[PDB]
A paper describes a structure:
ChoKα is upregulated in many tumor types, including breast, lung, colorectal, and prostate cancers. Given the previous observation that c-Src is essential for the interaction of the EGFR with ChoKα5, we speculated that this proline-rich region of ChoKα may represent a docking site for c-Src via its SH3 domain. Co-precipitation assays and surface plasmon resonance studies offer strong evidence that ChoKα interacts with c-Src through its SH3 domain, and that other domains of Src may enhance this interaction.
We also solved the X-ray crystal structure of a c-Src SH3 domain-ChoKα fusion peptide encompassing residues 60–69 of the ChoKα proline-rich region. Each fusion protein was expressed and purified, and the His-SUMO tag was cleaved to yield pure protein. Of the three proteins, only the Src-SH3(84–137)-ChoKα(60–69) fusion protein formed crystals and was subsequently used for structure determination. Though SH3 domains function as monomers in solution, the SH3-ChoKα(60–69) fusion protein crystallized as a dimer. The ChoKα-derived peptide of protomer A bound to the c-Src SH3 domain of protomer B and vice versa. The ChoKα (60–69) polyproline peptide associates with the hydrophobic surface of the c-Src-SH3 domain in a manner similar to other PxxP peptides with c-Src-SH3. Notably, peptide residues corresponding to ChoKα Pro61 and Pro62 make direct contacts with the c-Src-SH3 domain, with their backbone carbonyl groups interacting with the side chains of Asn 138 and Tyr139. Another important interaction occurs between Trp121 and the backbone carbonyls of both Pro64 and Pro66. Finally, added stability for the peptide is likely a result of the C-terminal carboxy group, which interacts with both Thr99 and Thr101 on SH3. Our crystal structure shows that Arg103 of protomer A from an adjacent unit cell helps stabilize the protomer B/peptide A interaction by forming a salt bridge with the carbonyl backbone of Leu67.
Residue numbers in the entry:
A (entry chain B), B (entry chain A): 85 to 158
Write the structure that this text describes.
């Protein structure tokens, strides 16, 4: 199905390559091989640019868990 | 106010000191200064132990953002 992310906070663009967005906006991630800045496309504003990946979460639950942090506790 | 986290996924205990929980449980964090495993207390099961911090989210929205990922886009 169409897989999107939702913004957890507002972000104000400050460069010519980042993307502003509002809390609750739905974003399509067009690229995530760049590190912790992801190339996103807004479903509601039609703008495109880089976003901080820690400002968004997946739009749907039922995702599978991430790897556990290592080391494990005792 | 009472600050809690919510489980995003089930977690099955596998060590001597970790804590099992179910998706949707609310957890009170009693120590989060030791690394990415946090000492938690279940509101519903009354159990206590270490949880993987990437399996939980804050219960409340409207917390403040994390600092912007390190390097930048220009
Ligand atoms: Zn799909
Ligand atoms: Zn409070």
């Amino acid at each position: 199905h169409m897989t999107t992310f939702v913004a957890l906070y507002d972000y104000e663009s400050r460069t010519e390559t980042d993307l502003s967005f509002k809390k609750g906006e739905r974003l399509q991630i067009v690229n995530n091989t760049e590190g912790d800045w992801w190339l996103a496309h807004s479903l509601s504003t039609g703008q495109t640019g880089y976003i901080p990946s820690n400002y968004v979460a997946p739009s749907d639950g039922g995702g599978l868990p991430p790897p556990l942090p290592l080391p494990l506790p005792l």
